[PDB]
Amino acid sequence: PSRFTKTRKHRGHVSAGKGRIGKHRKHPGGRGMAGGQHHHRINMDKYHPGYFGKVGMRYFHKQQAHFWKPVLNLDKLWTLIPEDKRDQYLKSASKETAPVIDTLAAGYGKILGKGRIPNVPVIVKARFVSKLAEEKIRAAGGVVELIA
């Protein structure tokens, strides 16, 4: 609110905290990003390297839905299972009746292998999987099923 701003505190002080020598002028250094190559070059090279120029190849009519591929690491791999059933599947770590985890239905496109999972079989349905994620799932007695 206005009653807590410093402009209430600058009442009675002639320069309003903007200085007597250098005043509050309109646009002393230009408007917006003016002079990013000439007189703001130091502040552009520092704190913004890479700003000027081109860096790659263009892509006309790019659609992000083509690249939609949310990643889920192995470190959770179990929040996709309901909390109550999680204990029941952690117990009885049998190759038969292994819990099935549809990661695409959970909203993921690629399964990555960051964490480690308990030594219990899990059937993981995924559009894509990392090599190490599949290796850890298989080492846990599970399998990866490719879906689309």
Partner 1 sequence: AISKNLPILKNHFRKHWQERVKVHFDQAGKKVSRRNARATRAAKIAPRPLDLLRPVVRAPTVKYNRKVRAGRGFTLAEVKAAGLTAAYARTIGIAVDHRRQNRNQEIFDANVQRLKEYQSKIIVFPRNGKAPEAEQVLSAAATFPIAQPATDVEARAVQDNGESAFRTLRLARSEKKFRGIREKRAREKAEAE
Partner 2 sequence: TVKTGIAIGLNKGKKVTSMTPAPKISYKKGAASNRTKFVRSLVREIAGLSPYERRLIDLIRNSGEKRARKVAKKRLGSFTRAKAKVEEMNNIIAASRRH
Task: Give the binding site for partner 1 (CB under 8 A).
Answer: 27, 29-36, 40, 43-44, 46-48, 51, 63, 65, 68, 85, 89, 95-100, 102, 104-105, 107, 121, 123, 125-126, 128-131, 134, 138, 141-146, 148
**Cβ of residue 63: shortest distance to Mg ion, in angstroms?**
16
Binding at 22: pick from RNA, K ion, partner 1, none (beta carbon under 5-8 Å per type): K ion
Residue 123 β-bridge partners? 100, 143
Does residue 14 touch RNA according to CB under 7 A?
A: no
The answer to whether the beta carbons of residues 90 and 82 sit under 8 Å apart is no
Which of 108, 96, 143, 107 is closest to 124 using CA atoms? 143
130 token code pair = 């990392």
